[PDB]
Design a protein around this ligand. Structure first.
Ligand code: HEM
Ligand code: HEM
Ligand SMILES: Cc1cc(N)nc(C[C@@H]2CNC[C@H]2OCCNCCc2cccc(F)c2)c1
Ligand SMILES: Cc1cc(N)nc(C[C@@H]2CNC[C@H]2OCCNCCc2cccc(F)c2)c1
Ligand SMILES: C[C@H](O)[C@H](O)[C@H]1CNc2nc(N)[nH]c(=O)c2N1
Ligand SMILES: C[C@H](O)[C@H](O)[C@H]1CNc2nc(N)[nH]c(=O)c2N1
Ligand SMILES: [Zn+2]
Lengths: 404, 404
């Protein structure tokens, strides 16, 4: 049953025994693999057993498995679920759970950092106003003048009687997308809809290519509220190129802080609908995907023309050439601005080490090959050559529907 | 909606559903518990129903399903199995099954060409010497002085209590890999074992980085015989760069004809253990994988030193720059020598067109995302953004164990 896992550069072999701890089904069956889809489409005893498993994971982590603290905490959980149909985590438990959700995230290549996570307990939040304050602290902390620090802030869990705490934005920092008369988009095409929502709720919009969006924050069962981030909290990096003087004239820039804000955090069967987290960028996210994706800023052609490349044929490799300069520009500019960035070689090399650490520690690591391999120069990185097993462990981050 | 996998393109936002996967009669490696999609390698009762399915497929494809000739062919197939334990394909059935196997191959991006395949029937072949003649005709035909033509030569099928026809080499044309006195390898490190098997069977070896290997050909129940390809038959392309003048001095080269020779061709339960097939190259196969893989020629550093890059640090993207030029050199040299090649941009754009063709014709196309997406410039190609469903259809090419 246990899958044999080979690295093809090195000829080495491991066996994933960790996958036996999965309690949640992915999208594949023996008839067909759907491993490449991005998104595929409680009652007391089910919660109670997810809770026990997690409490068990927690006492294992602190080497107190079977002790008196462990025993009585299980009793406390059974007592609370039996009476109320739910329960609550202690702060240390939450801290362990948040790190473990990151650790378990098959699509994250930055997991060597997993144990280094500042966890802000925001479960004593009763308003969108308070959410904003908490969010501003997270950003201030996480940014740290360019010396970025991984952080998560956790707002109040879901409850059966009421609506969720939610952040409408998919990240804490995002650029606006304005549909134009002419049918094109100024700004980021990925954010057209959230830009339109911000306007609908009273935002006076800019008209630039990089207008930081405001936040729509939603307390249970209320209209979302609009909050503009103080601009001094939002660190941005102007993009120049080491050798190409003209590159700066493109006026391209990106924000320092990658911070997901619409994923659900699940710990011990409890669900945290608003729990934004941030780390630091790997350069290809910006250099390749955000700037060069055809459904994003789509700047490749512009850059190739600047580079006076032959755009008439594909075989001149003008796309590859321009894409490299752009990734180079992102790395250079971040390093110049003294803002933390990792390149895809450094990142994937450290992910290989993480795979080795996890093998010894846990007997495996869930990993999504298509997400782990970078979007340029795939086979030039060691992860390309590494077979990977993908499965869902809890604690987990999940996707959740947009609240509108 | 529909109870078949929903399949999304993220560049375009368009949706399809795959209904072809319903036809799959063979389980892959994945289960709901865990996806294994990134793994490289993972009596008469059974034969007769496979045969029936194939005959049904043939008859549907010529629009004569349910007809008297369809039923008589079914009856003829049953009788032949009933008395001999096996059966035999009519000529046009083999032609159809061979193309269908190419059409069904999830790992091939060149499938838009599937309808154009020269099928050479070599089911009369009765010795190792004749296999050689057949193979020489294939190479001459397929090479066509650089205007390459897809072809497959089919030798006799596995028999009950009778040895297989086998080609021992993994491709018709491959370079030697000589294990050096100091652990390192001269030539292609992927070919150490086969090289050593050639020497063991009486080949006098060269001392070069690019020595074309001899063929080890095995008739049923006989030891393999060694055959040297006449060099006038093996078209090679010396590698040079359009602007970097020193690149020619590296003395790199590659062969024109990519020809898989150790795969099993399965058709209606019949097994063709010797059925070598060939197409033409996608440039990344040579420029990226064969030349730059750490476990192949590993020339990235050498080229980056020539290009005067900073190889002491990852963030100079020296690997990415050198890789781009090596690929460009491959494209340019093949073009100069008038030998067919396709770049990873054109290949993938044409594979997208193939997915549309197949949606309309069969209701889907089995595709292995990890293999379809090229090893450089991944997200710059349209296939990165296209979700794919992977499943096994028959007729098929299979991996098979090495005969020794
Ligand atoms: C510390 C530096 C970090 C780096 C360099 C990093 C890198 C990455 C990259 C490149 C991806 C793929 C992103 C994409 O292509 O959309 C990713 C995904 C992800 N990361 Fe990390 N990450 C870091 C920190 C974190 C932290 C702190 C967390 C949570 C505590 C986290 C959780 C996730 C999750 C849940 C995904 C999947 C996102 C999705 O499926 O939409 N990462 N990361
Ligand atoms: C016409 C030009 C063709 C092109 C451009 C092409 C392209 C490719 C590429 C890039 C791969 C992946 C190779 C690798 O990374 O190892 C591949 C795999 C494959 N191709 Fe095609 N191909 C062509 C013709 C053919 C033909 C004629 C056949 C057989 C009838 C074929 C059958 C296959 C099969 C079975 C694989 C899987 C190989 C494996 O798993 O080892 N292709 N093709
Ligand atoms: C925490 C962290 C570190 C890092 N280096 N980089 C990141 C980028 C995030 C993750 N992944 C993209 C970025 O976030 C973008 C917003 N995510 C929305 C969810 C989503 C998902 C799929 C398809 C969709 F249409 C929408 C996060
Ligand atoms: C027909 C055709 C067209 C084309 N453009 N390109 C090709 C390259 C073939 C396919 N794929 C690599 C090349 O052939 C190499 C032979 N591979 C043996 C099987 C194998 C599998 C995994 C790991 C291994 F070590 C060995 C064929
Ligand atoms: C269809 C395909 O799964 C999709 O384009 C994925 C591929 N791999 C990825 N890998 C990362 N890191 N991020 C992505 O957005 C994607 N997109
Ligand atoms: C581990 C991974 O499956 C392996 O390195 C695969 C990835 N994709 C590939 N894709 C192609 N076309 N050829 C290959 O050899 C590989 N190698
Ligand atoms: Zn799968």
């Amino acid at each position: 049953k246990f899958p044999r896992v080979k690295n093809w550069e090195l000829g080495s072999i491991t066996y994933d025994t960790l996958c036996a701890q999965s309690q949640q089904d992915g999208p594949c069956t023996p008839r067909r693999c759907l491993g490449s889809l991005v998104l595929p489409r409680p009652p007391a005893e089910q919660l109670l057993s997810q809770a026990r498993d997690f409490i068990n994971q927690y006492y294992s982590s602190i080497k107190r498995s079977g002790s008196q603290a462990h025993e009585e905490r299980l009793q406390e959980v059974e007592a609370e679920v039996a009476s109320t149909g739910t329960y609550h985590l202690r702060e240390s438990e939450l801290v362990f759970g948040a790190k473990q959700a990151w650790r378990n995230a098959p699509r994250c290549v930055g997991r060597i950092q997993w144990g280094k996570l500042q966890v802000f307990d925001a479960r004593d939040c009763s308003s969108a106003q308070e959410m904003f304050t908490y969010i501003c602290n997270h950003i201030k902390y996480a940014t740290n003048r360019g010396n970025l620090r991984s952080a998560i802030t956790v707002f109040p869990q879901r409850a059966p009687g009421r609506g969720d705490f939610r952040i409408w934005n998919s990240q804490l920092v995002r650029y606006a997308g304005y549909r134009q008369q002419d049918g094109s988009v100024r700004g980021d095409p990925a954010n057209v809809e959230i830009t339109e929502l911000c306007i609908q709720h009273g935002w006076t919009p800019g008209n630039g290519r990089f207008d930081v969006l405001p936040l729509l924050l939603q307390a249970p069962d209320e209209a979302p509220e609009l909050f503009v981030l103080p601009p001094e909290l939002v660190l941005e990096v102007p993009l120049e190129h080491p050798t190409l003087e003209w590159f700066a004239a493109l006026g391209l820039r990106w924000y320092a802080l990658p911070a997901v804000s619409n994923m659900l955090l699940e710990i011990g069967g409890l669900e945290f609908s608003a729990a934004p987290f941030s780390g630091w960028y790997m350069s290809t996210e910006i250099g390749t995907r955000n700037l060069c994706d055809p459904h994003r800023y789509n700047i490749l052609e512009d850059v190739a023309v600047c580079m006076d490349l032959d755009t008439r044929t594909t075989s001149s490799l003008w796309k590859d050439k321009a894409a490299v300069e752009i990734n180079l520009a992102v790395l250079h500019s971040f390093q110049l601005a003294k803002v933390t960035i990792v390149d895809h070689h450094a990142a994937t090399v450290s992910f290989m080490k993480h795979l080795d650490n996890e093998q010894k520690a846990r007997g495996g690591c869930p990993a999504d090959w298509a997400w782990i391999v970078p979007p340029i120069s795939g086979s030039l990185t060691p992860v390309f050559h590494q077979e990977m097993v993908n499965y869902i462990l809890s604690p987990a981050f999940r996707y959740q529907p947009d609240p509108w």
